[PDB]
Design a protein around this nucleic acid. Structure first.
Ligand SMILES: O=c1ccn([C@H]2C[C@H](O)[C@@H](COP(=O)(O)NP(=O)(O)OP(=O)(O)O)O2)c(=O)[nH]1
Ligand SMILES: [Mg+2]
Ligand code: NA
Length: 326
DNA sequence: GCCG
DNA sequence: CAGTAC
DNA sequence: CGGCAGTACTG
């Protein structure tokens, strides 16, 4: 429940500008600050009141003060005019800040420019084709139907397969940007080489319409990122992500795929302070790092049969999916 | 941008 | 590898 | 000063 709309809305514009211009760390600090403000019980009113909140420092406090006194924020007036166009371009799935800036430098200004003149990767041409649809969020009811479509095709050739929708869906959101389906098998073996069968069952259905990321050649494929559409009238194309994991990694894979992203990053950061390491595969202990925080020794994987175990081993109180937006 |  | 994405 | 999460594809 945000009690600081006047501040955050202005800061969000600044954050996105830095983000789309490639200033990733400056944008990160803004994100942390902006959210911290979203959580503060009351309207911040003093410069000193700003500083007290974790994630807000001198420079951010000064901008808050400027908004409180002026009603405007000077920096917003000197945002480059490239920014709306950079944002337009990097909302193409598969194009990031580097591609957007290259396109801009080549003189492109519109998606029509991109369509007719830009060189597109196979991913980007798919992203552009679905530009509007990928910017839409679906109601969670539709996410349920998509999960069930995948689960049916998976359990059709192995009833032992376990399928759960994660991401925003498992965090209880009303709408979902995509559907994230985690698949595993409680015997630790039969999960192997099933992207092959699953993806083909979903193609023969006509359910999958485009593949973005799908390394089907080597046999150790971990993820499928693609595009699906439910049958019948009134249906939009939706983004679909599927991961298949060993049963031993279920808790960590669940935790990762449920998110939020900032939640994962906070948790991973905490583990690092404890000489541990957390990934989608495993929670590890006795991890040896150099002075730049870079792993140089692998450490021991800890047994983590459930999500609660991960929290426990990290010395943290358990948090339900709905409580993990930050 | 923030923070140790 | 750099870029992009989850 | 310098890290800011830790991974998996693409070409
Ligand atoms: O940078 C990321 C992105 C995603 N993730 C994890 C968390 C996230 O909840 C999960 C699913 O990725 P999505 O892109 O689908 N985000 P989410 O489902 O939370 O929101 P949306 O409704 O936009 O799909 O992957 C990360 O750990 N790091
Ligand atoms: Mg999602
Ligand atoms: Na993009």
């Amino acid at each position: 429940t945000n009690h600081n709309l006047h501040i955050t809305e202005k800061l969000e514009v600044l954050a996105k500008a830095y983000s789309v211009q490639g200033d990733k760390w400056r944008a990160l600090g803004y994100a942390k600050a902006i959210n911290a403000l979203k959580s503060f019980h009351k309207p911040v009113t003093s410069y000193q009141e700003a500083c007290s909140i974790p994630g807000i420092g001198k420079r951010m406090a000064e901008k808050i003060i400027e908004i409180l006194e002026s009603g405007h924020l000077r920096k917003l007036d000197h945002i480059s005019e490239s920014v709306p166009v950079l944002e337009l371009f990097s909302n193409i799935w598969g194009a990031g800040t580097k591609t957007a800036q290259m396109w801009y430098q080549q003189g492109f200004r519109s998606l029509e420019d991109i369509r007719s003149q830009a060189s597109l990767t196979t991913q980007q041409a798919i992203g552009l084709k679905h530009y509007s649809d990928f910017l839409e969020r679906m109601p969670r009811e539709e996410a349920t139907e998509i999960e069930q479509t995948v689960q049916k095709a998976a359990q059709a050739f192995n009833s032992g397969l376990l399928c759960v929708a994660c991401g925003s869906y498992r965090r209880g959101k009303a709408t979902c940007g995509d559907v994230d389906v985690l698949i595993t098998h409680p015997d630790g073996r039969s999960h192997r080489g099933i992207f092959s069968r699953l993806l083909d069952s979903l193609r023969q259905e006509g359910f999958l319409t485009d593949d973005l990321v799908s390394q089907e050649e080597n046999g150790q494929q971990q993820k499928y990122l693609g595009v699906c559409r439910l049958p019948g009238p009134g249906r939009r194309h939706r983004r679909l992500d599927i991961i298949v994991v060993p049963y031993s990694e279920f808790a960590c894979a669940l935790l990762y795929f449920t998110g939020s992203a900032h939640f994962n990053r906070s948790m991973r950061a905490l583990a690092k302070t404890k000489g541990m390491s957390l990934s989608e595969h495993a929670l590890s202990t006795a991890v040896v790092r150099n002075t730049h925080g870079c792993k140089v020794g692998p450490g021991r994987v800890l047994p983590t049969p459930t999500e609660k175990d991960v929290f426990r081993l990290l010395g943290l109180p358990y948090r339900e999916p709905a409580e993990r937006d930050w």
